[PDB]
């Protein structure tokens, strides 16, 4: 009964496993630009563009488990200057484990200097709009800045009635509460699978200061790399 | 569905042993907005109801509440028009079945009994809802003469001599009982005037030949007839004098 | 709604609800004896104006060889005992040999479990004790559960349970070295123990003795002076 | 877990909190947001707890363009120091087995800060009592013994209907199935003897805007919030039931 | 040719009826007091499985009565056996009696299965 | 009426079934359709809101022909409209075959009303989301126009509208006097009303879909000739302008 | 429709549906029956609320195959349905066994119908309680079929309003055996004890049963008994 | 917020007069792969985009053959697609078998709509979640019919449905006049250009991910596989 | 019941698995010329005969089975299996094969777990016996309906622990003769429950014999010598 529930709680809870091989990541090394990539498309765009020049040494991975997705939560740092950090999180973090993930990443001793740039993709249906969802552009994107970000967003902000939940919202709430500059980019795309249109829509972000100097241009190298991950796991027979 | 609530599920009894869906069906009958009366005289049975026509584009002729099930049996309807028409059609089917099987005309008592059985079916099975309408049957019986029977969605079919149904049902019933206690001859003109004046005084409005519709069945002519506006106007003049 | 849905821990529901309903449904008792398996019940309320046209209340006769007592819902108990009689007569029509007790209780528990398995019906929440001599084995007593499986409880009590007293009275005589008189004495003692309100008073409890005399199962119900002396034995027990 | 918006950590000494509850639909939260918008209660802090699923969005009460571009976390608190009025605002669904920690944390917060009276707007199920809800008014109240006797006599003069005291396992313990959080929160407050009152309403799932209006009118009648067109609805009360008509459907 | 040997037997007490359609080897058997085609299963000897392969054509899948009877009859005879057991509950012992009932007829009338 | 608006077999405390009302208001969601019962015959007019140029002219047609004599103008969900059109076709054909002569409009009207009411009765099936105007003219029966509200009412109208602009359309129609004139002018009048009720700001564009049945077309429901439709549209545009 | 059972066991184990049905039965006109030595009577109150109501149309008593007779307290459409079902059962039994249906089996059949209607989904328990009559073997019968399906043999019992007071009155009045022509007097006095006014000839109905069977008698016949 | 209460079933009306389940079905078509349908005065070309994955894993046969003059392409659930294709084949075959006449496309679409309307009305069902682009050639001439997951259908000059089909719709709307007065090769090239604009900038029309079905004045509906699409790909400009 | 979990687990079958886990430990060994079953017992039976609580039964003479979980569904499945065995013996007139009845039970469980109108059986039938040619058998079905042949299986309370212990212990040297198989089964049961004695419900079936419910006196003496061997 209670013991079984306790065993499940451990199974669901996030466990931080170091990649270099109970101290939190930011507690171990401070960061200056921690980039969060949520979802397959976000991490794909990160790998294509940002993780093109530099060592990007693996520092940690927040392995976890949930009924939906067990993928990976590997964290990276440039290793040319460890000041800048990164995170490619593809595994879905459940609601009961998002705050555990936040504790593992930051804990209780933040630096209050990181420009937390969050990369995530949502579905068009989530976008609360006056008109029908079919009229919206397929890959359009939105941004959610915090109080002390002060850096102009490259895209229009979200409308009032629209909201965001789950892990990106968790990190943004943590940043807002502790006064950490940040911005949450929403790439509202009709296709949630790996499609290069979604990353093409993610492109405008590398132009702005957020994640600006990390990419060493080279569109040809990135564009060729984008075609690499276009090949993915075989889909089912549900849709044709 | 699994509607646990007593107020939104017919089958489940209320904690005080009441069927809230039946009460809400009665409230629907009230929501119909109209009122109807029926009086059993010593020579005939009457049914008087108001015909309020929204606007003028609607054809006044089409909108009606006086229906005939069997050529001798009349009816007046109160409640939602769709439910009223459905119950009228079911009563017509029952009358046809009775005529085909038994071979003679369906008595009013038995017709109301059958309709009450159907209402019991509706109010017992959770699948469907009680029909939001009250039907009053009138007709001439070879043994009891004029007969007035009111069937209701609950499944209550007791016969009446003078009865009413609608939004003003309570006041109409009070006035009708007051008239009944006098116990006069109850002639054709007398009973028709009683019904029409009951409706007029409960609604506190003056009646016009086109504002109301009247149907009557009499011993002399067992066939049910809906009085034309000319006869209603003549009766209104009779009340005036 | 979810009348046939497994619980997360495997505790099928509505059958614990049947269990509780049985628990707060009186106190039916039955003890097996070598001379003849015994049964007992709790005649709730005086019921002065009630007429005992039926054989007895909560003690329904199953043909000539078996009798049963119930401690659950009265309507469900009535329906299930009617089905019991129907099945027993069915087997009698099939073969001259009357239905063995085990087979009939198995059939009834199969009906109960089928209700517990196929949706569309609330489980039959009645717990039954069957007495009766059988050509196979001998005198037998079975404890039925409204959720299914029966038992071979030689001594049992449903409703207010309190099986400690019945065990202390049954194992007292080696559980097999008893007599009928000892069976009535122990049954009265345990009923008095369970009957916290005052004590068993004649018409407050109804018992039936099922013994085979001269090769014939006599199902005799004790009442009036028969129960009057039983509580007199309770007075004897008090001393 | 109160985190000030700035750095002054404004003290809530001698204040009255206005918390909503996760009731049938969103009656309590809707009413709380409605009164917040009407009274123009400025944000003062951020109650960051680990009990609600995180969510973010722009300022629900946009008003000015500058105020429109803000951030609204799952748990934020606004206050109006003019009337010594503070008000928490719940806008999130709860995580499993986390509501009671919220109760304890907020009870400690109110006890330490000095917020005297906590008003808990909520709503219970429509059927509620044994047909008594259909016969009597939906509105009720449930005030802890620690509530100031002045407020108690004010309520008595208002001639309201007290909680039905629904029968529960021992025998008549107040049960509020619709609110859920309301029962445990009330018990925690009673243990802490913190002045608070639960203002609920027997309603059912669906559109609950009229229920919110009724509840805010109840609160106005008690504490004269506005004036015992009327309430300025938030800009958040938009696109709350649909996302446009698909042209092909019709 | 198809010999339509229709017969009835007072199985237990209820006068359960029977139907036969010989065809050539695809025997068809129906069982039930009431004239209803509730269930139906076809079974015939299979060279790939010791138990003749059978599938519940139509009716409740949680019956495993028509299919079992079809398998046993297909093992007894050769080729297909379209069993259509249509008893409501009949517990399970009664089904054994019917299996006995049909068995006796096959001995009495081997041609009129 | 929260809690009582999820099933068509549940009565609200007030005493109304909310599913039927939601069906009527979903009918309101669609564009307005107008029918007129003049002395000569019955004239229909529907604001066929064009969605995209890709759809070929005539697609998503709203004016169905149940039979040679009986037509139909619909609103609300078009799928339910087509299903009801098929049902009415079947009923009319059945009567024409069994009895041998064309169905009186009243019989079709009350039969389809009974069918839709039956659908509204039960919790499993949902009420039809479409309201239609069964209109027809016969040399003996006369010009008849019946609207079938999803509730199941069969009311004979001299003129009525159904859709988003139903109220304004009804006001304009009652300003018009629909008695003792040829349909030749009724087509122009109904086009005029459709033009007034149309909202260009909200509805980007629309197509005039006019059909009529009467002595001019020998009691047959046929789409108005292109020339007459063009003349009516020109008159409506001239009236709307200034 | 709604095949899944709607009467569901409560966590504690009580069937609230049957309890509400019993409450509805209690909220009904008193109906008292006596199992006297020479017959069984079923005097019930056919209360005309207004002069408009005509008792000559509807009756609260209904004989079954002569010997049997029934009354009710609550609802009444349910009573009519149950009367129809019981009459159909009596016809089937008589035509298939070539003998009138004995009382106990009719009670069992109606109780089984009640149990099915409270057990099967898609339907509600009948909100009525039936008092059987009968002259089986030449003795009275006073089985009281509760809405659940529990029928108990009685000698003096009321079921409608103030049924507890009526039961106490019968206990303090009813003789061990009594006799016909006095059971009606006792029942009328019980109704008086549990009436809201005065009784006319047609304000109450008597279901006296004898060798012939359960007879409704006539308003004039009962009126004679009221004067005595 | 409120729509969550009125979208669980298909038989519930929202307070906004909407049935969200039909909207979700209408989005199920978008969940499928993109397809393009356009016609000329003499031909009806049906161009479909096969999933750009390893065709070894699954041969995505979007374009299906219904009759000698009717063929359809799948956008959405495969089970509903198969059921609808089988139904259409039954009706066409029955027409040609009994009346010995080709079934008109419009009649077939009307039957499809009538069949697909029933699930929307009935409880416990769901609308057929697939969008068909019916390219047929009856007596009247070429016909491209759009069948939405709702029973509503549209007679369309040029259409494209599926994922990211808005670009194809824009292209088709920009060149309707050319489509009307084009021959076989030019019309096929126009459809292929629409599909390419559906595809991202980097991806191009390969033989692996393109399938086309053409029905014409004297041409039966023929599905051209990867090897048979190269002739149209050749001569088509990359830009 | 008919819905899958996000990971692809039917809830009803997992709940039935939990119910089985709460059941007694049905332990069997596939010995040559001898098949031994063993089920943990809750003792008790202070006023109840052991006849009615016999978890190990005999489906005909050449098959005997034990279960772990709820006993009502176990009783009904046992009744159905024995009825099928008798029907086969009647019509086909051959001894029913262990494979045949095991597949029948597995199919029944599959049928009951598929339809949503009925819940799955909350037991796991461990079936043993000898075929026509005398080959020892050992099978174990599941609520899902997956029948699997085993060398020496153990399912019930702490199924995994007893299973791995027996796998470590099970060897052809331990399967030789029949006393050794009895020792193996008793050792597994004692590993499950330390009390032993009455809790050890032991049943043995030989090649050409019927199911013999080994007497408690025989069970305890084997336990004593097993203890002696350990010392």
From Swiss-Prot, chain A:
Modified residues (Phosphothreonine): 21
Processing and modification events after translation: Degraded by the proteasome upon completion of 20S proteasome maturation.
Any one annotated GO CC term: protein folding chaperone complex
Cell location: Cytoplasm; Endoplasmic reticulum
InterPro entries: Proteasome_assmbl_chp_1
Record function comment: Chaperone protein which promotes assembly of the 20S proteasome as part of a heterodimer with PSMG2. The PSMG1-PSMG2 heterodimer binds to the PSMA5 and PSMA7 proteasome subunits, promotes assembly of the proteasome alpha subunits into the heteroheptameric alpha ring and prevents alpha ring dimerization.
Top-level lineage group: Eukaryota
Protein name: Proteasome assembly chaperone 1
Single GO molecular function: proteasome binding
Residues with Phosphoserine modification: 132
Oligomeric form and interacting partners: Forms a heterodimer with PSMG2. The PSMG1-PSMG2 heterodimer interacts directly with the PSMA5 and PSMA7 proteasome alpha subunits.
Reported tissue expression: In the adult, detected in brain, colon, leukocytes, breast and testis. Widely expressed in the fetus. Also expressed in a variety of proliferating cell lines.
One of the protein's GO biological processes: proteasome core complex assembly
Transmembrane segments: none
Record keywords, A-Z: Acetylation, Chaperone, Cytoplasm, Endoplasmic reticulum, Phosphoprotein
Family: Belongs to the PSMG1 family.
N6-acetyllysine, modified sites: 216
Curated annotation (Swiss-Prot), chain E:
A UniProt-annotated Pfam family: PAC4
Top-rank taxon: Eukaryota
Biological processes per GO annotation: proteasome assembly
Residues in coiled coil: none
GO CC term (a single one): protein-containing complex
Keywords: Chaperone
GO molecular function, one term: protein-containing complex binding
Subunit text: Interacts with PSMG3. Associates with alpha subunits of the 20S proteasome.
Role according to the record: Chaperone protein which promotes assembly of the 20S proteasome.
Protein family (similarity comment): Belongs to the PSMG4 family.
Protein name per UniProt: Proteasome assembly chaperone 4
UniProt source species: Homo sapiens (Human)
Taxonomic path: Eukaryota, Metazoa, Chordata, Craniata, Vertebrata
Curated annotation (Swiss-Prot), chain G:
Post-translational modification: Phosphorylated on tyrosine residues; which may be important for nuclear import.
Entry GO CC: cytoplasm; cytosol; extracellular exosome; extracellular region; ficolin-1-rich granule lumen; nucleoplasm; nucleus; P-body
Keywords from the UniProt entry: Acetylation, Cytoplasm, Nucleus, Phosphoprotein, Proteasome
Keyword Phosphoprotein: yes
Primary location: cytoplasm
Gene3D superfamilies: Glutamine Phosphoribosylpyrophosphate, subunit 1, domain 1
Phosphoserine found at: 3, 10, 12
Induction: Down-regulated by antioxidants BO-653 and probucol. Down-regulated in response to enterovirus 71 (EV71) infection (at protein level).
Record note on what altering residue 106 to V does: In a colorectal cancer sample; somatic mutation
Subcellular location per the Swiss-Prot or TrEMBL entry: Cytoplasm; Nucleus
UniProt protein name: Proteasome subunit alpha type-2
Family: Belongs to the peptidase T1A family.
Species assigned in the record: Homo sapiens (Human)
Function (record text): Component of the 20S core proteasome complex involved in the proteolytic degradation of most intracellular proteins. This complex plays numerous essential roles within the cell by associating with different regulatory particles. Associated with two 19S regulatory particles, forms the 26S proteasome and thus participates in the ATP-dependent degradation of ubiquitinated proteins.
Domain of life: Eukaryota
Gene Ontology biological process: proteasome-mediated ubiquitin-dependent protein catabolic process; response to virus
Residue numbers of Phosphotyrosine PTMs: 2, 20, 72, 117
Positions bearing N6-acetyllysine: 66, 167
Swiss-Prot record, chain H:
Chief subcellular location: cytoplasm
Keyword Ubl conjugation in annotation: yes
Sequence positions bearing Phosphoserine: 110, 177
A Pfam cross-reference name: Proteasome
Sites bearing N-acetylmethionine, chain numbering: 1
GO-annotated molecular function: lipopolysaccharide binding
GO BP: any one term: negative regulation of inflammatory response to antigenic stimulus
Sugar attachment sites: 110
Subcellular location: Cytoplasm; Nucleus
Keyword terms of this UniProt record: Acetylation, Cytoplasm, Glycoprotein, Immunity, Isopeptide bond, Nucleus, Phosphoprotein, Proteasome, Ubl conjugation
The keyword Metal-binding is annotated on this UniProt entry: no
A GO term from the CC aspect: centrosome
Triggers of expression: Induced in breast cancer tissue (at protein level). Up-regulated in liver tumor tissues.
Site of covalent link Glycyl lysine isopeptide (Lys-Gly) (interchain with G-Cter in ubiquitin): 115, 208
Subunit note: The 26S proteasome consists of a 20S proteasome core and two 19S regulatory subunits. The 20S proteasome core is a barrel-shaped complex made of 28 subunits that are arranged in four stacked rings. The two outer rings are each formed by seven alpha subunits, and the two inner rings are formed by seven beta subunits. The proteolytic activity is exerted by three beta-subunits PSMB5, PSMB6 and PSMB7. Interacts with NOTCH3. Interacts with ZFAND1.
PANTHER family listed in its UniProt record: PROTEASOME SUBUNIT ALPHA/BETA
Family: Belongs to the peptidase T1A family.
Identification of the protein by name: Proteasome subunit alpha type-1
Gene it is expressed from: PSMA1
